[PDB]
Design a binder for this molecule. Sequence first.
Ligand SMILES: CC(=O)C1=CN([C@@H]2O[C@H](COP(=O)(O)OP(=O)(O)OC[C@H]3O[C@@H](n4cnc5c(N)ncnc54)[C@H](O)[C@@H]3O)[C@@H](O)C2O)C=CC1
Ligand SMILES: CC(=O)C1=CN([C@@H]2O[C@H](COP(=O)(O)OP(=O)(O)OC[C@H]3O[C@@H](n4cnc5c(N)ncnc54)[C@H](O)[C@@H]3O)[C@@H](O)C2O)C=CC1
Ligand SMILES: CC(=O)C1=CN([C@@H]2O[C@H](COP(=O)(O)OP(=O)(O)OC[C@H]3O[C@@H](n4cnc5c(N)ncnc54)[C@H](O)[C@@H]3O)[C@@H](O)[C@H]2O)C=CC1
Ligand SMILES: CC(=O)C1=CN([C@@H]2O[C@H](COP(=O)(O)OP(=O)(O)OC[C@H]3O[C@@H](n4cnc5c(N)ncnc54)[C@H](O)[C@@H]3O)[C@@H](O)[C@H]2O)C=CC1
Lengths: 318, 315, 315, 316
Amino acid sequence: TPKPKIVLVGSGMIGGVMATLIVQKNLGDVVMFDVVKNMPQGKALDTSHSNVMAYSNCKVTGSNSYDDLKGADVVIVTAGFTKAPGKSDKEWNRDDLLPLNNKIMIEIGGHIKNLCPNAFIIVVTNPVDVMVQLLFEHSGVPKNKIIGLGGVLDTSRLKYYISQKLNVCPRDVNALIVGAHGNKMVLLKRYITVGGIPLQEFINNKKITDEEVEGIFDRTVNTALEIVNLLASPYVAPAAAIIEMAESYLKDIKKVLVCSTLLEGQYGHSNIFGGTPLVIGGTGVEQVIELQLNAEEKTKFDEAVAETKRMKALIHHH
Amino acid sequence: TPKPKIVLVGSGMIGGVMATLIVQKNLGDVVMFDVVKNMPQGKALDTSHSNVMAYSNCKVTGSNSYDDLKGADVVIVTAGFTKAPGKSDKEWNRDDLLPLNNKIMIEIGGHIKNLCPNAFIIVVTNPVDVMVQLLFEHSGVPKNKIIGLGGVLDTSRLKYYISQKLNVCPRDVNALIVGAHGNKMVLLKRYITVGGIPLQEFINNKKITDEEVEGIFDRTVNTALEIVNLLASPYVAPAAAIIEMAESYLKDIKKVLVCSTLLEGQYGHSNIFGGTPLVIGGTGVEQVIELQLNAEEKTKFDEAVAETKRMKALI
Amino acid sequence: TPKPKIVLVGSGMIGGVMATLIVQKNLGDVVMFDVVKNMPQGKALDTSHSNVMAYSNCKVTGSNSYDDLKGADVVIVTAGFTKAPGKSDKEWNRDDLLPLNNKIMIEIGGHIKNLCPNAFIIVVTNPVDVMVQLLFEHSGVPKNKIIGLGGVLDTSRLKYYISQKLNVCPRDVNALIVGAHGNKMVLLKRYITVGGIPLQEFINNKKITDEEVEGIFDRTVNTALEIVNLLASPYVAPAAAIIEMAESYLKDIKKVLVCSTLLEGQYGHSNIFGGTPLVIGGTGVEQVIELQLNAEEKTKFDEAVAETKRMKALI
Amino acid sequence: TPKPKIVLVGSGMIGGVMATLIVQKNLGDVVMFDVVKNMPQGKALDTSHSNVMAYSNCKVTGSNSYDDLKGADVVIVTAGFTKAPGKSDKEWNRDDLLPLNNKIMIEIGGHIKNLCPNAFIIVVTNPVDVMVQLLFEHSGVPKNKIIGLGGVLDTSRLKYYISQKLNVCPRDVNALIVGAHGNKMVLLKRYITVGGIPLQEFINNKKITDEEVEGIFDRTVNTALEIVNLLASPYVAPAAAIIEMAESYLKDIKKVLVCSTLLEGQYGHSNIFGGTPLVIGGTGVEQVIELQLNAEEKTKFDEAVAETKRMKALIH
Ligand SMILES: CC(=O)C1=CN([C@@H]2O[C@H](COP(=O)(O)OP(=O)(O)OC[C@H]3O[C@@H](n4cnc5c(N)ncnc54)[C@H](O)[C@@H]3O)[C@@H](O)C2O)C=CC1
Ligand SMILES: CC(=O)C1=CN([C@@H]2O[C@H](COP(=O)(O)OP(=O)(O)OC[C@H]3O[C@@H](n4cnc5c(N)ncnc54)[C@H](O)[C@@H]3O)[C@@H](O)C2O)C=CC1
Ligand SMILES: CC(=O)C1=CN([C@@H]2O[C@H](COP(=O)(O)OP(=O)(O)OC[C@H]3O[C@@H](n4cnc5c(N)ncnc54)[C@H](O)[C@@H]3O)[C@@H](O)[C@H]2O)C=CC1
Ligand SMILES: CC(=O)C1=CN([C@@H]2O[C@H](COP(=O)(O)OP(=O)(O)OC[C@H]3O[C@@H](n4cnc5c(N)ncnc54)[C@H](O)[C@@H]3O)[C@@H](O)[C@H]2O)C=CC1
């Protein structure tokens, strides 16, 4: 009543798993949009069959037309990059791709503005804390209707690694990672709990050492790289985190989830997006929650936003 | 699987919800055991039809024979009672009845020893922190294989009430309530978090006041009375709490759940069952976690265990 | 809609399980409404705490005010008498409930028309095929927006008992029971399948006999009575069946489910509700499926509707 | 109690979705095994983080060692060969894959025999009805402990396409496709129901025509080619199907599922595996159900088996 419409702008690795998880959870009709011909149509056809196994009823269709954004309730943006003939088979980077992905966000933004200005938008394209603000600018949606992936995914690694050292259920570890997604993400040792108990109690109990925690911190920061070196850019956990955020919206669950949001003085920053706990409910972002960071913690946050500002200033670089 | 076998020793209000939820979750075959004849058979038949709607395949039968404890993987004991004849609801409490219930735990206990010595046991019969040690003594099961209901249920109320004031998902509130189930429950204000963030931060931000938090503490302690005075009794939340515990064992999830377990020097206490965070995994109680309480909190724990020692030395 | 609102008009046995199952499935905010004071508020408080165990976020409140109907997406009507005031168990006469529940339907119906004319309505109150038509008349809702419980629950017994004989998953048995809920329900032997395979194949292979099938038919007709004789009461499976219907609507699943619906010519009958397969999607009843019954099946359906007409005439 | 151990022998496209779904359902610990170095370890690490989102607790690890078969409750085999060299350019052959995949089955089977002889085994590697038998033969496992994927996936296509024409929930359509997986699959029009109701009633009510059903039948057979032509071999639905079968075993659900199993006289066939409805419960295959086919149906079933026999005979 009447079945949510979710459009995946970008139907690559992450898009594929998202469509799969949507059908599993019966969350809404799915449009798998991509600029690549035939590929989304093929994945959508395959995925549509799994409705039988799942006892679900979600239409899954593939598209190469922006017209299919019309009426979307949720839009998830993983579109970007690319690569070209050069110049391989690893020549890609980062800094150079900022003008390229800025231009994809402008194109997507104008189409959202015209075809689904009331959608809830989740941005994924890297660097996410930059790209989400770019989409916000060009789509014209309210600040409470657009967020970026980061904290849900980054904290899942930290939560996971601790739970395995302490031999508890992974979701029984709670942790906050703030500021930005990426190498300057702020891991807050102070805010780690295990079954609601401060982590420092398990350190005092010699269940885990401070050296073991810092080991886990660096592993968390470096997880993307670790997986890229075994395989490629991670996509199962990012999809799961994005679906957890979209479901909180679609089912009005009001989960506290760390995501990238427009900062309006929080942490002393403005005119910029960054990672902070927020509450996602049926109206979008319902609350932005500002952690009461000490001096030393605020310095780390400042560094994260500074890096986002650095990259944002490169969208017209040559 | 072999499909787990879950025996409900007691098929009253809580037994009914537990059978229903076991079927929803496809968790195992269910034996609804009661001393009352025909009633558990009748409930079992009704419940068994919900396998269709649930796409599950759990056998649900009723029994009046202890022999059906044979081969039980998990045994949940709610067999009692629930209030006092001659006693009303505006006085709702608990008394005497302690020796009659000890005699229940003796009889059940012998049967566990005989027919399902390897079962995981969850005790729900009140006073819970007393009744569990009793079944522990009489059944002879290892200490890592029997726990009592308290903290999952008590913290659920506190978590729930705080979540409604702060307008967040109920399970995004975490909280620890320890010592004993009942009026002496230790509500640890310092150990409450919201989305992983200390409660104190929302107090600082004036989203909730210190006086609303004390009002909610009070409401948690007195929830059962509040429900009873409203012409209902709590059984839906207690059943869900118990099934969360039971499922953590059967699926080896290793959730941190506050339950009543044998204290062996924790909190300065021994030869008594107290409520404390523990880890429930496929081998039973895998870890008993001892909170690092300050003296003001250790006094409140001392007192809750005091009241438990008072009711035990008395049967 | 982000958070559906589901109003349970009647918070007795079935209403209790319904609210429990809605929280389990996170399906919507729940209003437990009843004429009895305080009781639905006590139940609603207990049930609300289970949101924690379920990782759900559904408000569950109790109500004695029909104003709570405003905003309802789904209204489930279990409100009614189960026996006549003053009468004994021996003088039990099913026709006696007709004017008593009729008055209740009239009361509820005026409130629905005023406060939630666009809700989807599910009627459970017995005799259901009469009561649903009465509420349809008094509420003024469209024919695609109101249905009665019957075939989901009735086929669940048949499905279950067959599956237990053949040793398969209960949901892998498909069966249709049409016409009316009650002793005249039409058990359609020709339409039973097991894993999609005609039941005849399993009879031919001696996996089950024609006499076993007949005994299962008798068992299915007589289930409520069987359960009542055992000192209970069908409410778990009725609750599950109703939530399956309400969920197919709320999530636009378009499941094929046998429910009581307005007949406009189907089976040669008009101006009456009777059980037939139908599709429940986001807009309500999306299709009414008329079975191509043979001569003998049709006269069984005639006798079921005849009986519904007889009770309706009494009003 | 304790946690089931599920080893994915093959951590490719289907492998990855399987590990994802196992974690979503908290079904058991997963070993992602592959001959390709590092790749399954990368997928496993990524997949393990999803435990937090799923509220699950499944260890997910990657392996290039067969030793990890030790203690497996369920082994799912998607490991194989494909592609081709020199050849130019549309004439990939064949068929020539059969001996290379047989050598994979010999290798896998020897380790299962040594390290997990009591595992339940699900074979996916094509041609499935040939490969499952080869693995049965090389592993030594009991006949009730090994099946091949086919009908769960093949019927999901037919169920789904009919549900969309009739506008009902996909799972409310039931259908039986038997004999073999692949172009000779036997689609039984007579055994199609919709909400329990014979398909012919919808045809009579003009909600679908005989021609539409036949175009749907042809689409069902052409589905893997349709998707290969657009993308690659299908993997999401195949994984979902396989996890449905594995779950019925692990939770003793006793669902009726059409899978490839050893025929011992059913349908007039012996010494060969074929697609047929069967019951999967905690002991493995608990029942093999033989459909009472007519003469025309029995002859399509013979043509399916004869093609299985044909490919099996290319193995020396
Ligand atoms: C924020 C965060 O935690 C993470 C972000 N990412 C990233 O999310 C993005 C997508 O990751 P995925 O692994 O799905 O990449 P992919 O290359 O498989 O998919 C991207 C797809 O977008 C298409 N695309 C390009 N331009 C498009 C456009 N204008 N519209 C739609 N699709 C487009 C392109 O064809 C490809 O299929 C990358 O930019 C990331 O770096 C990955 C992991 C975590
Ligand atoms: C620990 C905790 O947080 C809570 C504990 N309880 C309690 O759990 C018990 C059961 O509550 P319920 O609401 O289920 O009570 P009930 O009266 O509806 O059912 C108790 C059943 O036990 C049967 N019974 C009595 N003796 C028995 C025996 N020897 N063996 C099996 N069953 C027996 C008796 O016939 C009744 O059906 C009561 O003692 C409690 O105080 C309730 C809520 C919370
Ligand atoms: C159709 C079908 O398959 C089935 C129908 N039923 C029935 O569904 C109804 C409810 O069954 P339940 O076992 O829940 O009955 P209950 O007495 O426990 O609950 C009925 C509640 O309705 C209230 N009620 C009475 N009048 C009311 C009014 N005017 N407004 C609101 N609530 C009212 C009354 O106070 C009680 O709590 C009865 O009419 C049935 O015969 C039961 C099984 C199956
Ligand atoms: C029966 C049925 O309905 C279907 C069967 N299939 C097939 O299932 C197989 C795998 O499909 P997927 O899409 O997963 O292919 P992939 O190439 O991505 O994965 C194959 C993996 O196996 C590895 N592999 C090769 N030899 C191995 C060995 N000895 N041990 C373990 N892994 C091995 C190889 O490295 C690759 O990752 C192919 O043979 C199929 O034709 C597909 C769809 C349906």
